Structure formats: structure tokens, C-alpha cells
Amino acid sequence: RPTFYRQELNKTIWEVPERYQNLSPVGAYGSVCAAFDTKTGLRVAVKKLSRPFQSIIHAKRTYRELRLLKHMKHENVIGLLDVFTPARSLEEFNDVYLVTHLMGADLNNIVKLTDDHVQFLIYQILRGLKYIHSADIIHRDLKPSNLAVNEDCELKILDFGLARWYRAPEIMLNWMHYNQTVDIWSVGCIMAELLTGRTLFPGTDHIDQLKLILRLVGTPGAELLKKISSESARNYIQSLTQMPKMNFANVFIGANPLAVDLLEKMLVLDSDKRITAAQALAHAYFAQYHDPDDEPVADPYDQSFESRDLLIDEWKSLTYDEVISFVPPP
Numbered sequence: 001r002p003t004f005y006r007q008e009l010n011k012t013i014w015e016v017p018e019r020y021q022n023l024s025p026v027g028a029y030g031s032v033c034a035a036f037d038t039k040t041g042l043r044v045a046v047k048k049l050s051r052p053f054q055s056i057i058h059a060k061r062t063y064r065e066l067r068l069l070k071h072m073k074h075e076n077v078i079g080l081l082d083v084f085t086p087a088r089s090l091e092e093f094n095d096v097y098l099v100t101h102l103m104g105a106d107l108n109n110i111v112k113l114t115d116d117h118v119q120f121l122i123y124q125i126l127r128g129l130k131y132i133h134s135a136d137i138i139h140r141d142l143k144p145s146n147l148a149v150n151e152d153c154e155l156k157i158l159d160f161g162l163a164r165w166y167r168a169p170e171i172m173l174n175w176m177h178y179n180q181t182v183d184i185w186s187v188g189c190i191m192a193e194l195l196t197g198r199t200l201f202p203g204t205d206h207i208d209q210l211k212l213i214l215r216l217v218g219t220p221g222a223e224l225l226k227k228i229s230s231e232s233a234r235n236y237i238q239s240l241t242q243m244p245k246m247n248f249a250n251v252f253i254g255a256n257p258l259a260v261d262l263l264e265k266m267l268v269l270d271s272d273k274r275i276t277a278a279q280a281l282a283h284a285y286f287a288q289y290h291d292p293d294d295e296p297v298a299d300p301y302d303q304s305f306e307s308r309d310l311l312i313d314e315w316k317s318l319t320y321d322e323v324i325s326f327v328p329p330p
């Protein structure tokens, strides 16, 4: 058991093993410090969960994130380098610290990029989503601020599995029981923005947001309208002035025609017809980077816990178990 030390940073107590030095503040449900990991020589990011057992909700979210981070093993997905608590027993267990790679910027901080840069960033996001989606995990809130990018332009996806401008219309309006392509929609919005410099769909509310979408992609046709349950959703949509799909070749003029093709296939309104991550990786736009032998899928992931209703102390105990049984990477 490591020796721990405490400090105050920004009114919050950090108590971490002495292995980790030079904590400096820089997270989902928590606060994040950069640190130096003496043991491996790596620059790391440490996140301290804020009040991880405040309520059943916090407790089950704490477990959920620990289980997710423990399962993700992929170069473009944040995973666990360490996890620890200063508690020496379950009874005393009230704090959770999670250690991962420090990338040091977000995709906003990298941004108007060149085509070869866009190719490589979106390639990596899609390679990471192929892996996440194969574990039957959806991101649901993919956005430039949770794509962590280092100076080498290497990219990892953060804060997946936990959950305006990058969200799919079928989540804006609560349509057809959505699929993993909600996340494809967001990549399309992100890729657009990298190519043009501008937010594709900067809505001011859920309403303005949907209006901006269908201005690009057209109002739903009868094929998609057939698949909408809500009299309300249908009423709202069909009561709008009806709009055609724009010519993306015209909207994205100047861009690599291969990228415009890809964007058309990511920004389809009908989720059933949107390209998957694995399909997108095979698209000609990524010919320079694509390699079917090096785009892995994930090991089976057990999410049966999600459908259980447990007491705070049970979720806490299960989380503690998961802290104890953590095995470092080689």
C-alpha cells in the first residue's frame, strides 16, 4: 500500500500516493489535475470524483465509470492507468481517484484545419468509436471538448458511456429508439466544423437546433415519418414548412469531394440509413490511414448492472471491489 500525501488545490483536498508528483489543476463528475508519475515516467491526468456516494445516482454513476474505464483498452479511447483510494477499508471508503494519459488539449484547442489533418483526426475518432460501439457502448455526447488530443495530433475519446450543437436530431426530439449512429451524427458535425471553421448547427435551444438541422438535411419524408411514434413529434415536424435536402457538394464547396461524400453519409436524418463507424473507416476518404487488420473490436462488456436497482452501500461496495481487483497494464 503506497504512502499517501495531501494537499489543497482550488479548495479541494487531493490525497494521492507519493508516486504521483507535481499535481497541477487542468472532468465528468470530478476535478482533474495533471501529475508526474515517477514510477513509469509518464505524464498523467488524475481525476478525483466529486462526492461519489452522495445519492444512489452518484453511486451507480461512479460504478459505471469505473467499470467502463476498466474495460476500455484501445489507443483512441481513454482507459485506466491506475485507480486508488486513500481508504484502507470499505467502511472508510469515500473517495475515488482515476488515472489516465494526459493528452493536454481538446479538439477546440487544436482548431480551420487542412484536409490531411482532418483525415487523421476523424480517422482516429471513428477507429475509437468502432471499438466502443462493438462493446455495445454508445458515447451519446460526443463533442470537440471530449476529444483529448496531444501535440502529436494523437486523439482519445473521453467521457463515453456516461450521458446541444453536435447531438443527433432523434435525441433532440426523442424519436425512434436510437442506435449507435447518434455518435456518427456528432462526428459529422465535428468533421464539418474542422473543414469549414464554423459550427455546422449552432442552435440556441432544442427548437432552433432542430430548425437548423432540417435546413441542411430536409424535413423527413414519408419513409421516415412512418417510423415516428409521437403524434406530437409528427405533428411538430409535419406542421413545419417542408424543406428539401441541400446539395452538400454546393454547401461544402472547396472541400475534398471524398470528404463531402462522407459527410453526406454521416448526416442522414434517418438513423437507420446513417453510416456506421466500421463502414466509415472503409470509406475512400481514409485510404491513407485505413487498415482492417488494425481497427480492433472490444472484448465482451457486461452491462447487466445497468438494469439493477441497488442501495448506495451495495453500489459502493461493488465499486470498492473493482478498485481492489484493478490490474495495471504491462
Ligand SMILES: COc1nc2[nH]cc(C(=O)C(=O)N3CC[C@@H](O)C3)c2cc1C(=O)N1CCn2c(cnc2-c2ccc(F)cc2F)C1
Residues within 6 Å of the ligand: 025, 026, 027, 028, 032, 033, 034, 045, 046, 047, 069, 078, 079, 080, 098, 099, 100, 101, 102, 103, 104, 105, 106, 107, 109, 145, 146, 147, 148, 149, 158
Ligand atoms: C479533452 O482533454 C483535455 N483537454 C484539456 N484542455 C486543457 C487541458 C490542459 O491540460 C491545460 O489546461 N493545460 C494547463 C497547462 C498545460 O497542461 C495545458 C486539457 C487536458 C485534457 C486531457 O488530457 N484530459 C484527459 C484526462 N481527462 C480529461 C478530462 N477527464 C479526464 C479523465 C477521465 C478519466 C480518468 F481516468 C482520468 C481523467 F483525468 C482531460
